[PDB]
Amino acid sequence: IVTQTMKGLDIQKVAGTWYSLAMAASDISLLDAQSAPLRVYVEELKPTPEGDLEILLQKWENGECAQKKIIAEKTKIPAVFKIDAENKVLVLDTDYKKYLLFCMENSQSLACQCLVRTPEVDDEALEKFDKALKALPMHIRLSFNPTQLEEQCHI
């Protein structure tokens, strides 16, 4: 369903600190509550030397903001990785220095994010995210202010 990907992705250069500035999803129920399944906040991305991608994130479950770690295994397409359960991650676009657009999907369920390096509202990167999105059937879209970004689980 998502037919936008980044050409030439250097997976090593996305390592380190990120902020989930915005999130959208095909179904309201995937992002609606604090503990919605795809309301996940990205802390940091760790690409192994052999080209896999470890993701550190945060996730409200049972009243608490928990850390989580997950490995997204590489594929033959450099902009596409696999998490196990089945789930595909796709990198749509990034300039490495400021923003990164990604989506995750199954086999028409879908959630995408605007990751940014610093705790600021980047209008430019939200435009691009909004453009990449109009091509997709989203029904819920959220965004966070600089205060919430510095908080665990964006409270």
List residues near a second copy by CB under 8 A: 28, 32-33, 138-145
Cα(154)–Cα(58) distance, rounded to whole angstroms? 9
Q: Which is nearer to a second copy, 33 or 77 (CB)?
A: 33
CB atoms within 10 A of CB 56: 14
Rg (CA), the chain: 14
Partner from ligand PX9, a second copy, none contacting 77, C-beta within 5 to 8 A by type: none
Partner from ligand PX9, a second copy, none contacting 71, C-beta within 5 to 8 A by type: none
Task: Indicate the residue whose CB is closest to ligand PX9.
Answer: 102
Cα(1)–Cα(141) distance, rounded to whole angstroms? 18
Partner from ligand PX9, a second copy, none contacting 80, C-beta within 5 to 8 A by type: none
The binding site for ligand PX9 (CB under 6 A) comprises 40, 42, 45, 55, 57, 59, 68, 70, 83, 89, 91, 102, 104
Cα(134)–Cα(96) distance, rounded to whole angstroms? 23
The helix (H) or strand (E) run that includes residue 123 is helix 123-134
